[PDB]
Structures are given as C-alpha cells and as structure tokens.
Design a protein around this ligand. Structure first.
Ligand SMILES: N#Cc1cnn2c(NC3CC3)cc(Nc3cccc(-n4cnnc4)c3)nc12
Length: 331
C-alpha cells in the first residue's frame, strides 16, 4: 500500500520557476523551414521512430543530418523539438538547425548539425585511458547542462554519442526519449536500451529523476574501461536486473526495495536469488588494465548504485580525481 516518494537531490524545482511554456510542450507551435533547402545524399540509419539521412543545405552548401519521423504522437514531436530548442547552444549538445515537412507526405523531419563521427566500433578500441577520461568529462558537461535545464535524456548509450576524434569533439544526440523533470511526476519505465536501464526502471519505480542518466553513464564507463560490451548482459528486462544483482549483490537491492516500499513483480522472487557484491578485480584483465586505475574504479562505484538518490550528480562526478588531469589540461 504505497511506494515511498522521491524528489531529485539537485535541480529539483528548476522547471517550476520557469514560465509555463518552457516545459508545457503541448502548447508549442512548430516553426517550419523550407524543405526545398535540403537535398538528401545518403541513408545513415534506421532508428526506432525515424530514418536518418545525410543531406546538403543548398543555400550554403552546408552538410547536415536529417531525421525523418515515422508516425509518432504530435506531442512527442513537440517534446523532442521543445527540449532541443531549450538546450540549443549548451555544451556538447547537438544543435537542431531546422524543421521541415514534406508538403505531400506530411512527414516531419528534424535537421541537425553534422558531426564527422568515427565509428564507435573501432574508435572505442583505440581509446587511451586519457581519451576515455576526456570524453567522459565531455559527456558530463552535456548531462549537467541538460539536468540544470530541467531535462533528463533517458537514453544515454554509445550509439547516442557522436565523436569526431580528429577534432576531439563530442555531441550528445537523440533527444526523442528526453523528458522534463517535475517533482512527484511518475514517468514511463519502458524507456532506455535494455543493457543501460537503471534498477528503478527494472523494479518499476516511476518517480525517478536525472540520476537515471548517471546509471547509464556508469554502464558506458564500465564497458569502456573493462572492454566488455555490454557490461550488464541481460536476456530480457527481468534477467537484466539479475545481471546487476550478480555484481552489486542482492543485499543492497533488497535494502533499496525496502526503503522505497516497492512491490516486486512476483516473478522476480524466483530468479533473483542471493548474490554477494563483487569487487571490480573480477573484471580486470591484462588487455584492460591499462584503462583501469583505482580512481577509475572509485568513480564507477559511485555511479552504479541501486539507490538513485545516492548516485553522483553530473557536477559531483566532474570533481572526481579521475578527471584531475583533464580539468587541469583544459586551460
Ligand atoms: N543527430 C545527429 C548526427 C550528427 N552527425 N551524425 C552522424 N554522422 C555521420 C557519421 C558521419 C550520424 C548519425 N546517425 C544516426 C543514426 C541513427 C539514428 C540517429 N538519430 C536518432 N535520433 N537523432 C538522430 C542518428 N547522426 C548524426
């Protein structure tokens, strides 16, 4: 009879202090550009809700990326657009450049700045220890910004990070799952990719916040420093929690569940079992050691907690000793 409520420990009331129209995205009327300014060059991808193309803007010969949407509810498009507009100009956030509709096909299309992304297949296997720190820092810039701006991404994962390694340039993309944080709001748990889902999603706690992003970020980091993609390799949503439980241990899981008075889907009773909390050494090997340091491990531990309220904030993370060499070097 009742899960215990949660609020975010930071940036809690940011949207409340803004005018309505900032977060009330169903109000948003869309500014349409001229679709004849863009010619499609080649397909790049086929996401869940979109097909993605490289294009040229013929007015200025600018290279651009075009996301043509499949049928989605207008208020979700208004949501994606509103968040992009609110965040435009923020550090390492992708820039929305324009919005167009095919006059006949009535299909909306988002137009983005092009990033010359070297492929995350082969990039991630040439990344030095310093490289990872630098790019982890650059993602945290984006996350602290969007959080301070009342937004949670909700789909942080390698595919949604664009890196031009030649120009040491990073952009957090795909804001189509992002939502505004409002104290006491119960969100949809059917979000994020399986391997990147935090416990709150898996146990069905809806009153989550920005700290979801910090779990996902931990997942990314783990896979990068231990060179194990994906780090938590679940067979389905249920088993994903088990993979977490096999590392973080069942004791803290049940403490988390008590505190928030969560009702576990009675299925979980079977397969969760009892499991100790493992040390990170069980994942350190000769081919990864050159990426793992005590400071990296300390950092990771403080991202990957069941209790969303005890995970580092983006700002806290940025102050971690893991990034001292990076922070000092960025002068
Ligand atoms: N935004 C952006 C951007 C910017 N650059 N870029 C590149 N650059 C190509 C490698 C040169 C690829 C690329 N690919 C891609 C593939 C599937 C889905 C999405 N997506 C989903 N939601 N928004 C976007 C994007 N996206 C981008």
């Amino acid at each position: 009879s009742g899960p215990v409520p949660s609020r975010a420990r930071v940036y809690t009331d940011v949207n409340t202090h803004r005018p309505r129209e900032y977060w009330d995205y169903e109000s948003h009327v869309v500014e349409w550009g001229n679709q004849d300014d863009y010619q499609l060059v080649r397909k790049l991808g086929r996401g869940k809700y979109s097909e993605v193309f490289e294009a040229i803007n013929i007015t200025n010969n600018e290279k651009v990326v075009v996301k043509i949407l499949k049928p989605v509810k207008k208020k979700k498009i208004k949501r994606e657009i509103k968040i992009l507009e609110n965040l435009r100009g923020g550090p390492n956030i992708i820039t929305l450049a324009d919005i167009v509709k095919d006059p006949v096909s009535r299909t909306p299309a988002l137009v983005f700045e092009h990033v010359n992304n070297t492929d995350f297949k082969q990039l991630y296997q040439t990344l030095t220890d310093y490289d990872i720190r630098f790019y982890m820092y650059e993602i945290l810039k984006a996350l602290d910004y969007c959080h301070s701006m009342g937004i949670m991404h909700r789909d942080v994962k390698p595919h949604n990070v664009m890196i031009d390694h030649e120009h040491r340039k990073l952009r957090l993309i795909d804001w189509g799952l992002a939502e505004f944080y409002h104290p006491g709001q119960e969100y949809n748990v059917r979000v994020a990719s399986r391997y990147f889902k935090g416990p709150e999603l898996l146990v069905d706690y809806q009153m989550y916040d920005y700290s979801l992003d910090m779990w996902s970020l931990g997942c990314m980091l783990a896979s990068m420093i231990f060179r194990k993609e994906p780090f938590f390799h679940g067979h389905d949503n249920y088993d994903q929690l088990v993979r977490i439980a096999k590392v973080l241990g069942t004791e803290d899981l049940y403490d988390y569940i008590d505190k928030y008075n969560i009702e576990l889907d009675p299925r979980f009773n079977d397969i969760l079992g009892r499991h100790s909390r493992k040390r990170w050494e069980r994942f350190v090997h000769s081919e990864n050691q050159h990426l793992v340091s005590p400071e990296a491990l300390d950092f990771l531990d403080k991202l990957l907690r069941y209790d969303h309220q005890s995970r580092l904030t983006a700002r806290e993370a940025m102050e971690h000793p893991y990034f001292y060499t990076v922070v000092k070097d960025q002068a």
